[PDB]
């Protein structure tokens, strides 16, 4: 009775402490010791094994002292002996993989657990019978106790985390990894680097997000363990995005000593299901059979009707279906896609009638889906000569000077805006002109006719981006979204076209074409949905993803009706528009002058001609086929409404022959002219903020009604308005709301 059989730790449940270390030849083993040291309720080490490492005279001091330097040389947390024991000496635990057994087992203290060992382990396995029948150590079931983790002194620290290589710039212990530790698509950069400017869909390796905190409050005090698991999961997903990430797949990559490993394994499942629901992993164009739904059966019971089969509806439909939720999509047109619609009949090339460009591929779901599909994008070159009528290529210094001046007018507007309210908003177009004449009259500087036309060109570039003449767009709010982190990296041409992704998202889903929804009634126990021919559908929840213009036209009857607040938000945004023309030629007539540039600009002769074929795109990055695509923006959209396709073509060809005046231009052998503005179920290209409006409108439209009626679409995404990406993400957003 010289020594103790009781644990130092007050409240500890261990009635019979035994020493896991047996490092000292004088180890107390399971008998009496001066003091029992507590790592967990199930794990202790005696005073002499403590001293074996902690005392300068003992034979373990060497090792401990070295570890302590490293722990300090690429680590930040305190290197006590308890920390050393949890990181270096604590025996590993591994779960038997026999389906009928599944018992946890302690490995002998010299065996170093690896993924391979964890993957295939079953009771009794040693490098050099009836092992599964032996009872499971009692301390294992203990780990499930609510207080077990509170009785655990130091948080776990993962070893050889898949996330480690992507996290070199951090101290491993701040991201749940062990300091004592020693080709991914370039577009996958899920982790912020230390002190780096904001970018879209990026997370801090060392801080829990709002939603994470909300779902896992028990970690607000200490996130170490959560962060490590979440980081490991993200790294695994992006390491192989072509298959579903499962707990079985994650478990072998969780390497840490002691019973706590059991806690980590049991936690990785909850975290993984949270990441899946929010759409962080197991997403994109990944598809899974009935046998393999991504969420447990408890999310499964409920039904959804999704209205619209564009990127937004299809994203949500894909997500929900993958979750195991019963989904039905109703599409008005005779095709899926919405504002994604590819013409695949041009020999050797795919020409988008709608979207075909990706602005910022880093962390972009579109770039992820390309990886999953094994398709390539073409990054745009920089050069874009501004060609005049007829023939002269504008001096680049004139291009850069007027660009500089145009952005200048924008800066001053961003100053004038700082003290105005929505009630005081003025059209961007008006305020620009005004600032221009002001500046002109101040410093008498005058611009050449060509300078004024090049400015006309740059102005047209903003009208294109807004989908409207600037006299309808808000000076206060035109660029509201820039407030949020935007997608970094390459701007590309989706050569194969967005349709490839649309089709994958749609494959195997219950989709009803030519079924235009007319009535939505959510006043009863289930949502009653009625099409224009009187066909009835019903489900517990309904997701609306129709274009902004269709909400403004009130094409769908809501009962109860949308709120006045919602109607104001809906009416405060503009239904922006542009159209495209695509021309096929017998040969690449522009090669001599264009010299391999992806696109070239067309200087407007006069303000009146602004936006009329402002830019031409060479639609084959391989420089082999001959297809040009051009855009009609701003006022020019109007002037084309009353013309038939043949007439639009005439003016394009005439424009081209002016642009290439000093040479012959062959006749086109195939073309299309888009009519988005008069497509009855679309009537637009993309949204923008009208004068008097706020970026807040996007949130307000996005707001669900009574957790019964939900909304998605490009016009509901405040961070990323307008884009296929933003539309897709809004659909993922709603799928997460709905699945909860």
């Amino acid at each position: 009775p010289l020594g103790s059989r009781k644990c130092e730790k007050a409240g500890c449940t261990a009635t019979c402490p035994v020493c896991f270390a047996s490092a000292s030849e004088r180890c107390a083993k399971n008998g009496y010791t001066s003091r029992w040291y507590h790592l967990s309720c199930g794990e202790h080490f005696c005073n002499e094994c403590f001293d074996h490492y902690y005392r300068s005279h003992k034979d373990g001091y060497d090792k401990y002292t070295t570890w302590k330097k490293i722990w300090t040389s690429n680590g930040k947390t305190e290197p006590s002996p308890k920390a050393f024991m949890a990181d270096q000496q604590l025996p590993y635990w591994v779960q038997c993989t026999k389906p009928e057994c599944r018992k946890w087992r302690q490995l002998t203290k010299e065996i170093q657990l690896t993924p391979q060992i964890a993957k295939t382990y079953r009771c009794g396995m040693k490098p050099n019978s009836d092992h599964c029948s032996l009872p499971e150590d009692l301390r294992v079931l203990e780990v499930s106790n609510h207080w077990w983790y509170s009785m655990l002194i130091l948080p776990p620290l993962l070893k050889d985390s898949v996330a480690a290589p992507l996290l070199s710039a951090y101290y491993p212990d701040c991201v749940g990894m062990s300091p004592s530790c020693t080709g991914m698509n370039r577009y996958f950069q899920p982790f912020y680097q230390p002190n780096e400017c904001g970018k879209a869909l990026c997370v801090r390796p060392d801080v829990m997000e709002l939603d994470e905190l909300y779902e896992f409050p028990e970690y607000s005090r200490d996130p170490t363990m959560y962060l490590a698991l979440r980081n490991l999961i993200l790294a695994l997903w992006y390491t192989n995005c072509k298959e579903a990430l499962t707990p079985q797949k994650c478990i072998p990559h969780i390497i840490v000593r002691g019973l706590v490993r059991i806690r980590c394994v049991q936690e990785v499942e909850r975290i993984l299901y949270f990441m899946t629901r929010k759409g962080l992993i197991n997403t994109g164009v990944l598809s899974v059979g009935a046998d393999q739904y991504l969420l447990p059966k408890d999310y499964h019971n409920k039904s959804v009707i999704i209205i619209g089969a564009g990127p937004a509806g299809l994203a949500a439909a894909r997500q929900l279906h993958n979750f195991g939720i019963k989904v039905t999509v109703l599409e008005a047109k005779d095709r899926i896609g919405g504002r994604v619609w590819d013409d695949k009949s041009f020999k050797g090339v795919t020409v988008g009638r709608g979207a075909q460009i990706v602005n910022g591929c880093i962390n972009n779901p579109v770039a992820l889906m390309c990886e999953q599909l094994g398709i390539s994008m073409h990054k745009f070159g920089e050069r874009c000569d501004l060609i005049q009528e007829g023939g002269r290529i504008t001096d680049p210094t004139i291009d850069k000077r007027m660009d500089f001046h145009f952005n200048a007018l924008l800066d001053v507007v961003s100053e004038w805006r700082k003290d105005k309210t929505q009630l005081q908003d003025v059209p961007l177009g008006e305020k620009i002109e005004e600032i221009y004449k002001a500046f002109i009259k101040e410093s008498g500087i005058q611009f050449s006719e060509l300078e004024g036309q090049v400015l006309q060109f740059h102005l047209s570039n903003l009208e294109y981006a807004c989908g409207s003449n600037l006299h309808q767009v808000s000076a206060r709010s035109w660029d509201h979204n820039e407030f949020f982190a935007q997608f970094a990296g390459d701007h590309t041409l989706l050569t194969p076209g967005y349709s490839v992704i649309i089709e994958k998202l749609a494959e195997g889903l219950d989709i009803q074409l030519k079924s235009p929804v007319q009535c939505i009634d959510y006043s009863g126990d289930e949502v009653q949905v009625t099409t224009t021919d009187g066909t009835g559908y019903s489900a517990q929840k309904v997701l609306v993803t129709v274009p902004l213009a269709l909400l403004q036209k009130g094409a769908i009857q809501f009962n109860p009706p949308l709120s006045e607040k919602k109607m104001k938000a809906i009416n405060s945004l503009g239904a922006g528009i542009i159209e495209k023309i695509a021309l096929q030629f017998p040969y690449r007539f522009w090669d001599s002058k264009v010299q391999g540039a992806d696109f070239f600009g067309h200087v407007p002769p006069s303000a009146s001609k602004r936006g009329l074929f402002a830019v031409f795109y060479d639609m084959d990055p391989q420089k082999k086929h001959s297809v040009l695509m051009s855009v009609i923006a701003g006022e020019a959209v109007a002037s084309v409404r009353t013309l038939d396709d043949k007439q639009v073509l005439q003016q394009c060809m005439a424009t081209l022959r002016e642009l290439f005046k000093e040479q012959e231009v062959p006749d086109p052998t195939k073309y299309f002219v888009t009519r988005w503005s008069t497509d009855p179920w679309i009537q637009m290209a993309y949204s923008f903020v009208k004068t008097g409006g706020s970026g807040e409108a996007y949130d307000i439209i996005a707001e669900d009604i009574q957790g019964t009626v939900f909304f998605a679409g490009e016009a509901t995404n405040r961070h990323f308005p307008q884009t296929v990406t933003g539309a897709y993400l809004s659909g993922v957003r709603e799928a997460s709301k709905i699945a909860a």
Binding site: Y192, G198, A200, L201, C202, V203, R204, E209, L210, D211, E212, Y214, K278, G279, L280, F483, F484, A485, H719, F720, L729, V732, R733, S736, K737
Partner: peptide
Amino acid sequence: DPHFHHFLLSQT
């Protein structure tokens, strides 16, 4: 600062 915050983990 929501000039950093992940769009998908900021919905509450």
